[PDB]
Design a protein around this ligand. Structure first.
Ligand code: DGD
Ligand code: CLA
Ligand code: CLA
Ligand code: CLA
Ligand code: CLA
Ligand code: CLA
Ligand code: CLA
Ligand code: CLA
Ligand code: LMG
Ligand code: LMU
Ligand code: SF4
Ligand code: SF4
Lengths: 144, 40, 80, 124, 64, 37, 165, 67
């Protein structure tokens, strides 16, 4: 498996538009693109409101925040048995592939993943806040 | 009949009967011993 | 960004990963539990702090914990 | 993606907006403020003159109403000045720049005060 | 061989557990050397609605 | 000598109610939107 | 008398209050005929009112300047001056009934915790069991002391859940 | 075109006091009995939410009509 490359030419689902879509943040900060392959034309629900028709084959939609792309991913995966992926697109044209991060969806354990933010103790074994006082900022005993 | 008497043993029904009885006892005492403020 | 930590009481049931609406968590190989897998929090810059993961965790007390931290556009969930 | 309506996308509407000094690029920012200042300064005297605390006084009403409108123009000019200071700290239209907005604010003050004065002349 | 017998009663000693100082019934004890092999089931559910949890060998003591 | 002039309220009340608050708000507004290096 | 109060039987305000209350009823009684039902109801109220003021004075209640009975709560003053029936005796009447209710409920709770499904006996009452316990609760003061002396009333600290400290 | 006509089912539900003595029978979640006091409140909040007890539209309609 290798990181896919976004194709901006991909056609988008049939949709008449709405007032729930992108704002000035997309022009200045970042936006998100989700793509998937559809087996047939089918009506699905937009996370921004309304019904859209996915074209047979490649599809492409743009969203304002990451949660919107993953919300549609959950719908497509569970209700239609599809395998979408999405990216983060910066105003200068840079594209950052996001999901699934390593080609395998996170709920399925995969080799080569390195644990992060794992504490080798129980919650009840955290130290008292007095022991981390005056550490340079506000920090919980769970941060050590 | 077993099931019906089981229904009558549910909390709301028992509470209704018990409080109806308790209220009746308190009302009837005040009917025959009106305006009690002290014990003599 | 919020702070998400996984503790060694995890049973590797995967329910926190399935419940995360932001894809913050994932399952990695482990040897400390029967399932031989542990939850991980590699992408905490995207955590919004909803705590759906904590709601999904079966262990007592929790094995995944969210500590709300500094607020950015991502953590605040803004689309503008 | 976006919802297009006759109000949002119409030929008559679009042409009218482009003619307004706010959207008329290629014009010096100071001139933009003066034209915008004159329009707003003239109308502002109306409500103060007809509904102020001295409205019923025969001749003082015109002076007080226009004089109060002039004070509101000064406050508005100060609001423009600080807005430019905050918004522009670090492009095609010179108006949206630190130097351009300052000139635009200055024009609004001169135009606004003149508009108030012109309104007073019309009354008397 | 390791841990209490299946079906026996144990007392929970984990302070942050909902069932601390309460009694549960042993379901099974993993022999694979996991951190928390003892599985205990309780009559009363915790605030999350769960009635079973895993504990270490030293976090359970025979009831009574 | 301590007695202020009879006209002091006419000046100080507008000064502390309209003028100084206006300067304080303007000064604070620019300060809270200023961008650090 | 106690705390500057005076007996209601000797209080002018107390006597005046009764006249006003009866006077109010008498005014209403004028507009009705002698045998009509409203007249019978009003006169019955008047008889109850006169009995009430007669009984309270007979009981020896102390009246304030307002002419209203005032109760005495200190056991020493109440027992010294014959006011024990105002607060002191009613005190032990309540505590007997209240403990009766509490003790009977506690017995039922303990009895059903040995059943297969204790929670089912709390929403569907075991009326035969509840009835038996209700009758036996008349001796709760004796039963409660014996449990206190036997060390069975209270549970041991090692069996009570607490939060971390 | 479907003819407009009367159409019923004979004896769909037996008349019995058995379910009166089984609180929460109507719901799959609550029929197992209480473990906490929240069960008691849930019993009453869900009592008339017919469509949350089943997906059959016919079953819902009959309950509405007799209610
Ligand atoms: C003169 C008038 C001035 C008016 C100012 C109004 C301010 C409104 C905003 C208040 C607010 O957004 O406040 C929010 C902050 C939040 O506080 C802190 O917020 C922090 C937020 O942390 C986050 O952010 C931190 C930032 O460093 C870190 O990054 C950290 O990791 C991250 O989690 C932490 O949670 C701290 O524990 C927490 O204390 O303050 C609070 O909530 C409370 C702060 C005040 C405490 C005292 C309140 C007493 C009230 C008495 C009742 C009034 C009676 C009036 C009577 C009058 C009669 C005439
Ligand atoms: C703190 C709460 C409180 C208290 C202490 C009282 C006390 C009293 N109220 Mg009041 N009352 C209250 C709240 C309270 N009330 C409230 C909230 C309301 C509004 C609903 C009323 C409305 C009210 C009315 C309308 C009347 C009273 C009356 C009474 C008297 C009843 C005595 C009686 O029936 O003896 C009967 C004797 C008994 C022993 C009762 C118990 C019987 C069992 C079988 C004993 C078993 C022992 C073994 C008593 C002085 C009555 C009265 O005459 O007051 C002067 C009266 O008419 N109350
Ligand atoms: C509270 C609202 C209000 C009030 C009381 C006034 C009062 C006045 N306006 Mg103003 N005006 C207002 C709001 C108001 N205006 C607004 C919002 C606008 C923009 C749509 C205008 C646009 C306007 C114009 C274009 C003119 C007036 C004029 C007038 C005068 C009345 C008409 C006349 O005698 O000639 C009077 C000074 C006239 C006038 O004499 O102005 C000096 C005039 O020509 N007003
Ligand atoms: C909305 C509520 C309201 C309204 C309508 C008024 C109205 C009035 N107040 Mg009162 N007042 C209010 C609330 C209000 N007050 C409150 C809450 C307080 C307590 C703080 C006071 C305290 C107060 C005081 C102390 C005084 C007044 C006075 C006045 C009078 C003059 C105000 C003035 O000069 O305005 C000037 C108005 C403007 C500059 C704004 C005009 C807005 C225009 C008309 C909008 C038009 C939009 C347009 C349609 C858009 C077109 C778009 C496109 C087609 C071009 C006037 C009768 C004064 C007086 O003497 O009264 C007799 C006075 O001394 N008020
Ligand atoms: C904290 C104390 C305090 C408070 C709450 C007030 C409150 C008030 N003062 Mg006073 N004042 C004070 C101290 C204070 N003063 C002192 C120490 C002096 C001597 C320098 C004055 C001199 C003064 C004058 C000359 C006037 C007031 C006036 C007023 C009123 C309107 C506000 C104003 O004009 O402030 C103005 C405040 C100052 C010039 C002094 C501020 C000093 C601190 C350090 C800032 C108000 C009742 C006005 C009034 O009476 O209106 C009817 C007015 O004309 N004050
Ligand atoms: C302590 C604060 C303060 C002070 C000193 C004033 C003072 C005044 N208010 Mg009030 N006001 C205040 C707070 C204050 N207000 C607040 C907080 C609110 C919001 C709730 C209001 C809302 C309010 C309303 C709604 C109205 C007033 C009005 C007035 C005027 C009433 C007297 C009159 O008939 O004027 C008549 C007007 C004049 C004699 C003109 C005086 C000079 C004008 C205002 C400025 C001229 C500036 C000049 C051209 C250029 C700058 C000169 C400078 C550098 C020296 C007066 C100027 C009334 C008014 O007329 O407002 C304009 C009025 O309608 N006020
Ligand atoms: C809730 C607290 C409380 C308070 C503030 C009082 C207050 C009082 N009590 Mg009471 N008393 C109480 C509870 C209380 N009592 C209880 C619970 C009981 C039952 C055990 C009694 C039994 C009682 C008796 C038997 C007598 C009083 C008496 C008194 C009065 C004078 C004695 C004295 O100094 O008492 C202050 C109270 C205390 C320091 C607390 C303990 C009081 C003990 C129980 C009684 C002490 C009596 C005293 C030695 C008598 C001296 C001779 C007397 C003629 C003055 C005084 C107004 C006397 C009185 O005036 O009777 C008419 C009296 O003879 N009380
Ligand atoms: C078996 C019944 C029972 C008993 C013996 C007790 C005993 C006690 N309660 Mg508890 N309690 C009960 C039921 C009971 N409670 C119920 C049903 C509730 C919910 C309303 C509460 C809510 C409650 C609170 C909020 C508090 C107590 C407290 C207390 C303590 C002090 C007394 C008090 O404040 O009573 C007050 C009593 C009540 C508020 C509710 C009484 C309701 C009825 C009368 C009880 C019996 C009803 C039951 C259905 C009967 C079953 C009979 C059976 C044959 C079928 C004491 C240990 C206090 C404490 O912790 O003190 C240290 C305290 O803060 N109780
Ligand atoms: C069955 C037979 C029943 C007979 C019967 O009950 O007769 C009722 C009896 C007798 O009835 C009375 O006397 C004659 C009959 O014997 C009369 O004919 C009347 O009926 C009546 O006056 O009355 C009582 O038992 C009444 C007792 C009232 C006691 C009230 C105490 C109030 C104390 C308040 C304390 C508050 C504490 C909390 C405050 C703390 C601080 C915040
Ligand atoms: C044990 C039986 C004792 C009988 C005593 C009869 C009364 C004797 C005269 C007492 C006069 C003074 O009153 C005294 O006794 C009262 C008896 O209720 C107490 O009350 C008073 O607190 C006490 O001061
Ligand atoms: S708090 Fe929400 S976004 Fe963050 S890890 Fe948990 S479920 Fe995901
Ligand atoms: S839900 Fe809890 S036990 Fe399950 S994988 Fe996540 S952290 Fe571990």
């Amino acid at each position: 498996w290798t990181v896919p490359t976004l194709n901006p030419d991909t056609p988008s689902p049939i949709f008449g538009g709405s007032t729930g879509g992108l704002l000035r943040k997309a022009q200045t900060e970042e936006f998100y693109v989700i793509t998937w392959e559809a087996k047939k034309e089918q009506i699905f629900e937009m996370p921004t409101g309304g019904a859209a028709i996915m074209r047979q084959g490649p599809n492409l939609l743009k969203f304002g925040k990451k949660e919107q792309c993953l919300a549609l991913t959950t719908q497509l995966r569970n209700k239609f048995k599809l395998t979408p992926c999405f990216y983060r697109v910066f105003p200068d044209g840079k594209v950052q592939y996001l999901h699934p991060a390593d080609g395998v969806y996170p709920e399925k354990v995969n080799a080569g993943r390195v644990g992060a933010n794992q504490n080798m103790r129980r919650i009840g074994q955290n130290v008292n806040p007095i022991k981390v006082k005056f550490s340079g900022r506000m920090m919980s005993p769970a941060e050590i | 009949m077993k099931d019906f008497t089981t229904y009558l043993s549910t909390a709301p029904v028992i509470a209704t009967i018990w409080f109806t009885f308790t209220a009746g006892l308190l009302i009837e005492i005040n009917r025959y011993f009106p305006d009690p403020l002290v014990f003599s | 960004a919020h702070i998400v930590k996984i503790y060694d009481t995890c049973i590797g049931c995967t329910q926190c990963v399935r419940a995360c609406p932001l894809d913050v968590l994932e399952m990695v190989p482990w040897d400390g539990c029967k399932a031989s897998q542990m939850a991980s929090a590699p992408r905490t810059e995207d955590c919004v702090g909803c705590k759906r993961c904590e709601t999904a965790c079966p262990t007592d007390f929790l094995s995944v914990r969210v500590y709300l931290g500094s607020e950015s556009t991502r953590s605040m969930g803004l689309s503008y | 993606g976006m919802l297009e309506t006759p109000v949002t996308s119409a030929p008559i509407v679009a042409t009218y907006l482009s003619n307004l000094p706010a959207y008329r690029t290629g014009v010096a920012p100071v001139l933009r403020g003066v034209e915008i200042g004159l329009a707003h300064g003239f109308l502002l005297a109306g409500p103060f003159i007809k509904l102020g605390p001295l409205r019923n006084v025969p001749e003082t009403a015109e002076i007080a109403g226009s004089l109060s409108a002039a004070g509101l123009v000064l406050i508005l000019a100060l609001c423009l000045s600080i807005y430019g200071s905050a918004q522009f700290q670090s492009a095609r239209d010179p108006l949206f720049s630190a130097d351009g907005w300052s000139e635009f604010a200055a024009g609004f003050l001169v135009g606004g005060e003149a508009g108030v004065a012109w309104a007073y002349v019309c009354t008397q | 061989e390791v841990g209490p017998k299946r079906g026996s009663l144990v007392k929970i000693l984990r302070p942050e557990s909902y069932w601390f100082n309460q009694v549960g019934k042993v379901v099974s004890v993993d022999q694979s050397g996991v951190r928390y092999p003892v599985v205990v089931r309780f009559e009363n559910q915790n605030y999350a609605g769960v009635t079973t949890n895993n504990y270490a060998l030293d976090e359970v003591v025979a009831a009574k | 000598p301590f007695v202020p002039p009879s006209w002091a309220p006419s000046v100080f009340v507008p000064l502390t109610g309209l003028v100084l608050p206006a300067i304080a708000m303007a000064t604070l507004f620019v300060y809270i939107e200023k961008e650090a290096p | 008398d106690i705390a500057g109060l005076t007996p209601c039987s000797e209080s002018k305000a107390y006597a005046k209050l009764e006249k006003k209350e009866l006077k109010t009823l008498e005014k209403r009684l004028k507009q009705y005929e002698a045998d009509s039902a409203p007249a019978v109801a009003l006169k019955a109220t008047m008889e109850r009112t006169k009995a009430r003021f007669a009984n309270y004075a007979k009981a020896g209640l102390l009246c304030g300047n307002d002419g209203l009975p005032h109760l005495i709560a200190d056991p020493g003053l109440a027992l010294k001056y014959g006011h024990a029936g105002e607060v002191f005796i009613p005190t032990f009447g309540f505590l007997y009934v209240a403990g009766y209710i509490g003790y009977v409920g506690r017995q039922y709770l303990i009895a059903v915790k040995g059943e297969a499904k204790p929670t089912d006996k709390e929403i569907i009452i075991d009326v035969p069991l509840a009835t038996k316990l209700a009758w036996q609760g008349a001796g709760w003061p004796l039963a409660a002391v014996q449990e206190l002396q036997r060390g069975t009333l209270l549970e041991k600290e090692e069996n009570i859940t607490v939060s971390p400290r | 075109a479907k003819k407009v006509k009367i159409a019923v089912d004979r004896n769909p539900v037996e008349t019995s006091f058995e379910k009166w003595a089984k609180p929460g029978h109507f719901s799959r979640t609550l029929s197992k009995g209480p473990n906490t006091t929240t069960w008691i409140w849930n019993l009453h909040a869900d009592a008339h939410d017919f469509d949350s007890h089943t997906s059959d539209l016919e079953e819902i309609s009959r309950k509405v009509f007799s209610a």
